[PDB]
Amino acid sequence: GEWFRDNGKHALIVYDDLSKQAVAYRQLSLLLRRPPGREAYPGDVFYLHSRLLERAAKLSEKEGSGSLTALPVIETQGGDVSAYIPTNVISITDGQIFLEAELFYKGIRPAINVGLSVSRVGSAAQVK
Amino acid sequence: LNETGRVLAVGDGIARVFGLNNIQAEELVEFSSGVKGMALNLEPGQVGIVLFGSDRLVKEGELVKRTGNIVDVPVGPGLLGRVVDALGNPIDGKGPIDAAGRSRAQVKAPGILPRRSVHEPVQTGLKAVDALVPIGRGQRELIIGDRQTGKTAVALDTILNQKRWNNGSDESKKLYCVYVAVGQKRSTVAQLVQTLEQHDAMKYSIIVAATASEAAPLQYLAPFTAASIGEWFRDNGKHALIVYDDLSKQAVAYRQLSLLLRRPPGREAYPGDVFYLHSRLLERAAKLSEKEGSGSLTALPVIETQGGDVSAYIPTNVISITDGQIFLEAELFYKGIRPAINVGLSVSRVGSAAQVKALKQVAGSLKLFLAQYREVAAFAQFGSDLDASTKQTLVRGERLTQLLKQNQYSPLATEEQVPLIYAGVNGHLDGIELSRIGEFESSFLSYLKSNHNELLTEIREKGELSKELLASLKSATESFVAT
Amino acid sequence: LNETGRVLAVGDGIARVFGLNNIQAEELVEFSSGVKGMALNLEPGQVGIVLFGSDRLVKEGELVKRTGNIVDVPVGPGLLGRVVDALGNPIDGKGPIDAAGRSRAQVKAPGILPRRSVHEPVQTGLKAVDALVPIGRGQRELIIGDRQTGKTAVALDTILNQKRWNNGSDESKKLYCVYVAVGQKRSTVAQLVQTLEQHDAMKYSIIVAATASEAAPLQYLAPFTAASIGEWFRDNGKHALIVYDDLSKQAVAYRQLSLLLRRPPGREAYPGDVFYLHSRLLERAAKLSEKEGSGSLTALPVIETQGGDVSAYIPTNVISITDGQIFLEAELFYKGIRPAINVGLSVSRVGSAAQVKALKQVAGSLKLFLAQYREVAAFAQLDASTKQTLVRGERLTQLLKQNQYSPLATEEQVPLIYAGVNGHLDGIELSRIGEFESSFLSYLKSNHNELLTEIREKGELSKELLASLKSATESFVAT
Amino acid sequence: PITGKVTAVIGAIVDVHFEQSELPAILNALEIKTPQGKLVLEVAQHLGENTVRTIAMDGTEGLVRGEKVLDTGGPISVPVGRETLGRIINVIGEPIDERGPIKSKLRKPIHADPPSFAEQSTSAEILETGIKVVDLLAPYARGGKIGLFGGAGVGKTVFIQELINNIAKAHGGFSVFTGVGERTREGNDLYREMKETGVINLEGESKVALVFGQMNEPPGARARVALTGLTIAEYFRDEEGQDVLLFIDNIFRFTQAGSEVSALLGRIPSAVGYQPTLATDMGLLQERITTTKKGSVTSVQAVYVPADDLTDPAPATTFAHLDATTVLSRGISELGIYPAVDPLDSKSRLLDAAVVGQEHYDVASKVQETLQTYKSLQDIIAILGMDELSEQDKLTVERARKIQRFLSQPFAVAEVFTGIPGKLVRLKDTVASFKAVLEGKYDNIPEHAFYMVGGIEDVVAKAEKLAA
Amino acid sequence: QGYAAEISARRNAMDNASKNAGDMINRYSILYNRTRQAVITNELVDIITGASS
Ligand SMILES: Nc1ncnc2c1ncn2[C@@H]1O[C@H](COP(=O)(O)OP(=O)(O)OP(=O)(O)O)[C@@H](O)[C@H]1O
Ligand SMILES: Nc1ncnc2c1ncn2[C@@H]1O[C@H](COP(=O)(O)OP(=O)(O)OP(=O)(O)O)[C@@H](O)[C@H]1O
Ligand SMILES: [Mg+2]
Ligand SMILES: [Mg+2]
């Protein structure tokens, strides 16, 4: 995606999904016998997802003009938003599109929970 | 040092021995001081011996000799009425054990082919158990619950009930009981043996004791040798009931051994293969086919939960291994419900196949009424108004709950259980004051035994309610309820 | 290499040293850069030194040399009015310390036979504590509560009150005060010293400070060296009071040391011996027998609970060790009920033996009244008697309020608690109760000074004194 | 004699190298000379290369590598017999009452095998304590094993001292009190109270022996003093053939002490950091306490509950070893209901209709049913309040509140700080009073009349005083 | 008048019920946070012991 970003083009990247990347990184770290952290994740998983997600950027006119837009996907077990990796990514990203199982099985689809969903860039990006 | 070794280090019940090149895994060794041990760990330059006694006796430089024997225990009918330690040595203070043979502790469970489907009841004499969670011969019914809830009481009543048949001539009904005390204090086992001898249940029972002070390997090894003792009856066409009180303390003993051998810990520091332990123990309980003499061995594991937490490692393991659970709760205990069985959480997966046909017939709707009652009681507690049908549900369910109360060491024959469950389920108790149910039972049986003895005789000998018996039972219940 | 060694490694505040063959366990050693340490592990061929300072000061290959002393600190009366670090070095900048001697940081607490029953009062000057939770000389009374609930306020008012006697001539009555700030902000300790100097309480106090930034071993050590400083007063027939503010932060520093030594974490990740840390510290607070010189060392540990959880690990440990507890409740503190004593949970097992007889007379059967008032409030959440109980309990609680840095002598407390228990306040509006005290005392000083002097000197209310107090109280209340 | 050199010192653990290859057997006592006199170490492990790892019974501070160690040739051994009565004994058996040597003709090792299964004797005789809640809902057994469970600051010590005061005189046999890691102040208080009430008599015959390893002691001492107490009690049981009271406060401190040394001994920590050997260590200790055919030992034990967590491995494992249990609770204490015994969690073997009779059993079971109903209605009472309860639920809640308050009782020991005179209640009086309360005979009495009184007679008298 | 008093009383009763339930929510939120920290600590201790075998 950063090739499009750097060369003056716009790119969208969807990480489907970051929970399983975190699981794989945990697997690597534990099998490399590195010191475990909380919930047996490595000591620097936050530096995994931040290292990844801060590459999504909107560049100024002097740096060409390019954008890389990231839509990471996160799977919350039993809908627990307070889990470790979700806690990291929710702080990492500029908002949430939160999908609720109850709405989904009510037949309300795409089932977005409007109360919890927020875009912190918000109205600045919206079409007038 | 092929058939001998010498101690490199010793402590906390573990000895590390140099040599013993030819020793087999789990083989026994004898130290020159006379204490024995078991070679759990074989390593490139060491053997890890777990000691069956005080490590005061062992010391560095101690010579160690192979026994050439894997753990084995005496077995046979000569153990009936005896108390033996984890290795079959008598501790009751009487004479030797007249063993019919010896059997290894670790033995392969019967495979797919030898077995037969569980179809013979284990009549516990407990109304709740026999009515709602039947136990069959060859079944593995977990008894699980917090401390001091009545687990041992349930198992002990099941043992005491067999005196009806153990005095008879029919060898196919007689059930021989083995009770394995793991981690219990010797005075508790002494009280248990006086309870059995007072009720004269000892003459068909066996006690295997690995009490609290006995070395961890013996507490570990007692369930397996007790299973080997029980398996003789299974393998010779007889029936056995083995009660493991308590498997959690065996798991604790294995955690001790594995941690002191420095085997990698798992969850809650238990070793990674404790499930293999309880599984290879419990799969030995089986019902065999005619080609194998139709013997059986029934297991009643006891598990002590902490604070009701069934999510713990060992509780989940044994729950997932066994064929069902009897759940005991403190809340029901103080509400006066004894044996305090939570009939909602309790489940028998062998199910009605293990139930006497008469009690199957009358108990059919009991489960439904109790489920409805537990669902509805929240309305009464919450202060909400009650519909007529919900009020009827409560009046029925409260009396059914009262009807399942039972005093300790007072098991009921099924000829006595069937009339009570019939009367309760058909709603003939609904008019009686809730306080008087206990008066009803004691009187109603006394009535039937005196004025309707034919019904009890026929229920016992046939085991099934024909239409004539059921109609006569209806008439008798209506007669007595018109007290 | 017998009397010196060379650092093999440095990390996490631990220096592995080669040599030091003749070193004693827990001996104090000096590094080439002047930072000191404790030889905690003696191992085959190496020694593990815990550093009383930042490990930036230590490098591989640096020479380390013995001192020949188990870790010890200066003690004596020359420390009065001084602020010192965990090892007794002066940090107030007022110059050297005139030590009467040196005493080891950690010492066996006096056994069973040397001791005596606690039978003298530690006059806190707080109505609530002096009335409901008596503290005796040789007692060890826990002050426990949530952050910013007046814990240090209670300890500090107790320290300030002693000026009434420490200015006198009788050492049987004086009470010298030692205070350890453990993990506290250094600015807070500076302002606390300023507060003591304003009230003139400094000239008999000692401050032993191991503030937040200082290496964990110093925070761990400070309570023990301050206990050693107070034990000089204890052992020489003098009376001392030692405040630990907090012990919780000491436990945190000890957890840091233990986990950086890679010892197994226990409950709440504290090491298994975190109990022994506080037990061997607090058992040193004792009252000695006549054969041992009759001295004493009173202790006031301070514990910060999170969310008011007294059931946590360290709080329960210290509650197990101490002779009682003063529980300071945030919910009371927010409603303006200060010093915010929760009289339901607060208990002093020494009890009556520590109390002044006059207070035991007038404050008799008051401890039950306020818990009964709390139960009445729960029941309401009315019977005529319960309404009367509510009316009197509210105004008693108004009497138990007290402004900071304003301790009352028992001659002043006794009239107020008398008027409260005997129901004279029941006719006076609540808003004016704070005035009542100020006026009421002012009257007794103005017109009945003989009665107050008699209460002071005799320590008991005879029939004549009790009736005179009744008459004066009624006369004022009607006026 | 066999001699060795100290090679390592860490905390309470000391490693000794014996060039004379005949190493001391495990549990042997070793002696180091110091300015304090002798320091006694106990051999815990053999490490190989002639090195043994040992636990110090006193402070290791001041030790130097290369310091000489002498093997005593046997375990720690303590005086026994009637010469120990009326005296205070240290863990290693030295007197610490400053009254000179203990002149016992016999001295016995503190490590011994528990009695065999054939030696066990069992009985069902009620030990009347005079405490309403205990005598009603959890009767104690003479010759049985009794355990107080409770967190910090609930009243384990006051309850223990009340039991001592009530039972010691009535027992008439011998007594042993073992302070295991508990308050030194209360050791002195017990000593002086015993010396004033005459059960200890410096000028004559005494009936109690005292052993103290109080909480100021290193973990090595706390891990072994209980065995010294057990050794004196066992000498009274087996050799004197007498009947023995054995008080232990606090047995948890034994288990905790082992944990403190467990990591230094090189063991892998078990759950929540306890030693792997917890269960077998505690079994080896506690099942020596059993009564036997030679004599009867009535043992009362206080058990600490860390962080009020009854699921903690130590209390949880201790529960299996007792005939009677009394679970003190902070939740009850906060109500002001001393002695704070939890009437539902407290449980006893002897609450059996064949032992206590049908009337006592019925009264106790009805009391517990009422209390359980009241506890089941807590959430409803909190949210909706009393008005919405069913009318018979209202009646049950009122009777449950009155039973709660009637189970409180003022002990004479607590009078120092409660100011309420001590009160004692006989068993039959307790049963009659609670039967009367259940039967509604005193429904008209205000509930505060039940708080801190003994017997229904005092309830009516306090009702009169509240009516005045 | 009885109907008016009934409805007013039910208003006030539900108000008190809601306030009591809110207090209980505060208490159980505190207990939940404590249990959360305890669970994390215990699981992490198990992991660390497994690593340092
Ligand atoms: N049906 C019953 N009726 C009355 N009391 C009973 C009944 N069953 C058990 N009890 C009582 O419950 C208490 C505990 O019983 P039991 O020893 O069987 O429990 P347990 O769950 O096996 O206990 P533990 O975990 O201590 O071994 C004892 O007082 C026993 O008398
Ligand atoms: N009796 C009182 N009257 C008025 N204000 C008081 C009283 N006691 C304490 N305060 C004030 O309450 C605040 C907190 O007091 P203090 O510093 O003693 O509490 P603390 O519990 O020691 O706090 P921390 O946990 O921050 O150390 C300060 O403003 C203090 O002035
Ligand atoms: Mg049991
Ligand atoms: Mg403060």
Residue numbers in the entry:
A (entry chain A): 256 to 383
B (entry chain C): 27 to 509
C (entry chain B): 27 to 407, 412 to 509
D (entry chain F): 8 to 475
E (entry chain G): 224 to 276
Question: Which of the paper's sentences describe this entry?
Answer:
ATP synthases use a transmembrane electrochemical proton motive force (pmf) to generate adenosine triphosphate (ATP) from adenosine diphosphate (ADP) and inorganic phosphate (Pi). ATP synthases are macromolecular machines consisting of an ATP-hydrolysis-driven F1 motor and a proton-translocation-driven FO motor. The F1 and FO motors oppose each other’s action on a shared rotor subcomplex and are held stationary relative to each other by a peripheral stalk. In Saccharomyces cerevisiae, the FO region contains subunits a, e, f, g, i/j, k, 8, part of subunit b, and the c10-ring of the rotor, while the F1 region includes a trimer of catalytic subunit αβ pairs and subunits γ, δ, and ε from the rotor.
We purified S. cerevisiae ATP synthase with the detergent n-Dodecyl-β-D-Maltopyranoside (DDM), which results in a monomeric preparation of the enzyme, and determined its structure by cryoEM. These conformations resemble recent catalytic and binding dwell structures for an isolated bacterial F1 subcomplex imaged during ATP hydrolysis, where the absence of the peripheral stalk resulted in all catalytic dwell structures being identical and all binding dwell structures being identical. For yeast ATP synthase imaged without ATP, the catalytic dwell structures show αβtight either in the open conformation lacking nucleotide or in a closed conformation with weak nucleotide density, and the binding dwell structures show αβtight only in an open conformation without nucleotide.
